[PDB]
Design a protein around this ligand. Structure first.
Ligand SMILES: [Cl-]
Lengths: 212, 223
């Protein structure tokens, strides 16, 4: 069986810039390598086969090179629609092998999250539950920390957090955070605060509402 | 024209089995191998195996020998993968894809050039549960306003979310579902001009096929 070592595991580069990914096979694969693109939420796509042969519906920005055990894949003039995970594949054998993948992200200017907070709907309340939701949308860079306060006091339990993959138009990230309580407990408190720390501000970015 | 159409999502109990199908159209079925590929939740694509539908000939990555069995029915142009006796390690998305059979000096052009849409397989003893869908409307005014839908308490994945039946596609973020105590929760946001809501209608459309659930939830300002 032929093993494939794909590097690096992650790459970050600027718009208009250029990146290269490498793959090394455990033995000579005689130029039978292909490269595939996996964009978030979609199925894989063929970009190149036999080391350097492009599909005709793939931009000429994409290319490939190499021989023997050592191969590379390059993208020039990076666009935000290039955001994706990339895989090599060897097919110089009856049994094929994918490389481990390279996640590509783009750099851009720092952007502060736009923060919205939402109280529980009447529909949820009437069934006995109460969830409070905060969206922290279109920020950069990706690292952010969110805390929930109820009348000032920190609540860690019952918090569900979810992050998007990088946006393929503006190269920002977004985050949802949901604090789930009971109706009973929701109705005992007044102030609900979504507090975010992000490198774009010295102190936290907060959104709150008062139940009454 | 060239199409590979996979069967729908499967929920499977630990220790049980399931059979996936991939219906090919738009080309000569027996001139192409059918390969299958696994996409685990975290981490990368894994090649499972190949089948030559003309003869029944197969080959597997070692790790899947004993687990997967590839067959086909030529009359219906349909490839099958039986996944036998499963655990949570087998939870994933599974693809079929085609490979040009004929030998050429510089190998095939048809190197996984077309793919099926994927079949999601979840291995779990939790019960199918429909989502509750709750509107997210603000409790302060700017030129843009952000609304939402909370899709809570469902199992198993996936669900579909759209806004105004497809029309609102710009400024939508639909967040990946998170699993907590055997139930998934997801949310979706949409941003529109504050001049346009709540003076006009914004609705989230949620589907959960495993439960036969379709909901439309109109976002109305908060009482
Ligand atoms: Cl593999």
């Amino acid at each position: 069986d032929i093993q494939m070592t794909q590097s690096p595991s992650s790459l970050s580069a600027s718009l208009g810039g250029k990146v290269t990914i490498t793959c090394q096979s455990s033995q000579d694969i005689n130029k039978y390598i292909g490269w595939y693109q996996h964009k978030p939420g979609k199925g894989p796509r063929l970009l190149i086969h036999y080391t350097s042969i492009l599909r005709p519906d793939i931009p000429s920005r994409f290319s490939g090179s190499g021989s023997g055990r050592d191969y590379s894949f390059s993208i020039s003039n990076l666009e935000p629609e290039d955001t994706a995970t990339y895989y090599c594949l060897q097919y110089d054998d009856l049994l094929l092998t994918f490389g481990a993948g390279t996640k590509l992200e783009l750099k851009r200017a720092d952007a502060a999250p736009t923060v919205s907070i939402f109280p529980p709907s009447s529909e949820q309340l009437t069934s006995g539950g109460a969830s409070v939701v905060c969206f922290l949308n279109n920020f950069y860079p990706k690292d952010i920390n969110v805390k929930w306060k109820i009348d000032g006091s920190e609540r860690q339990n019952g918090v569900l957090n979810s992050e998007t993959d990088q946006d393929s138009k503006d190269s920002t990230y977004s985050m949802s955070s949901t604090l789930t309580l009971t109706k009973d407990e929701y109705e005992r408190h007044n102030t609900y605060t979504c507090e975010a720390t992000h490198k774009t501000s010295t102190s936290p970015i907060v959104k709150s509402f008062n139940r009454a | 024209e060239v199409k590979l159409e996979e069967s729908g999502a499967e929920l499977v109990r630990p220790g049980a089995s399931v059979t996936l199908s991939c219906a090919a159209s738009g080309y000569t079925f027996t001139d192409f191998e059918i390969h299958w590929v696994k996409q685990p939740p975290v981490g990368g694509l894994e090649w499972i195996g190949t089948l030559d539908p003309e003869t029944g000939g197969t080959a597997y990555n070692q790790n899947f020998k004993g687990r997967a069995t590839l067959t086909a029915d030529k009359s219906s142009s349909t490839a099958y993968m039986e996944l036998r006796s499963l655990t949570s390690e087998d939870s994933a998305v599974y693809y079929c894809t085609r490979w040009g059979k004929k030998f050429y000096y510089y190998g095939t052009s048809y190197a996984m050039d077309y793919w099926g849409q994927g079949t999601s397989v979840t291995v779990s003893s939790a019960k199918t549960t429909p989502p509750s869908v709750y509107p997210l409307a603000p409790g302060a005014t700017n030129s843009m306003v952000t609304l939402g839908c909370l899709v809570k308490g469902y199992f198993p994945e996936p669900v579909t979310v759209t806004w105004n039946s497809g029309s609102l596609s710009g400024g939508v973020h639909t967040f990946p579902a998170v699993l907590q105590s055997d139930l998934y929760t997801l949310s979706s946001s949409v941003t529109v001009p504050s001049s346009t809501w709540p003076s006009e209608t914004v609705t989230c459309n949620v589907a959960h096929p495993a439960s036969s659930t379709k909901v439309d939830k109109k976002i109305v300002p908060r009482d």
